[PDB]
Design a protein around this ligand. Structure first.
Ligand SMILES: NC(=O)c1cccc(N)c1
Ligand SMILES: [Zn+2]
Length: 198
């Protein structure tokens, strides 16, 4: 089924992080509690209209990918959509909206940048009790600019529609950055817990 494929993607993309679980917590797998498909017709039209535009500018190819997004503002994103106006220029690839192909990378951003102070009730970044929320998004990358080192962009590079952060000696894992909110749709809302290693 549809939700089994989302759970498998969530579980199989977990990696061992270099910070030893400082930001996201210590875990090898999750306890998937709920997977909800977000049905926001106004946001979907905004996304498909921009997707068609990008396809025409990238040899009839949208370069669409299913990627994870961690944020304490998931409730605002599912109702209002992604918003580049809230993006900070101080990020590695500048004022963009960041996505990961590894669920455990996006899990480090659920309670804030670098996990913030953790869950709101126990102030624990490795909290195994509090229910976390992650987004599994449809992202239009189009002509993606391949980059290894820090490149503080305000917008996509000329002639491009996104930035792909590739790992080097550098990033540990890949990341995908868009500079227009309408180039991503929050398709699935995942309610989960990080699980204590066995
Ligand atoms: N907010 C996120 O899920 C995310 C994804 C990739 C890279 C970064 N920095 C954040
Ligand atoms: Zn907690």
């Amino acid at each position: 089924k549809e939700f089994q494929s989302v759970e498998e993607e969530m579980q199989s993309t977990v990696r061992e992080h270099r910070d030893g679980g400082h930001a996201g917590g210590i875990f090898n797998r999750y306890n998937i509690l709920k997977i909800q498909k977000v049905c926001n017709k106004k946001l979907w039209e905004r996304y498909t209209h921009r997707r068609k535009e990008v396809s025409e500018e990238n040899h009839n190819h949208a370069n669409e990918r299913m990627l994870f997004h961690g944020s304490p503002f998931v409730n605002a994103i599912i109702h209002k959509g992604f918003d580049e106006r809230h993006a900070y220029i101080g990020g590695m690839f500048g004022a963009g909206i960041y996505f990961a192909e590894n669920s455990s990378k996006s899990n480090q951003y659920v309670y804030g940048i670098g996990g913030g102070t953790g869950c709101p009730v126990h102030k624990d970044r490795s909290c195994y009790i509090c229910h976390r929320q992650l987004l599994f998004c449809r992202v239009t990358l189009g002509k993606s600019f391949l980059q290894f080192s820090a490149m503080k962009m305000a917008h996509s590079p000329p002639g491009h529609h996104s930035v792909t952060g590739r790992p080097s000696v550098g990033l540990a894992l890949a990341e995908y950055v868009i500079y227009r909110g309408e180039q991503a749709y929050p398709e699935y809302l995942i309610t989960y817990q990080i699980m204590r290693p066995e």
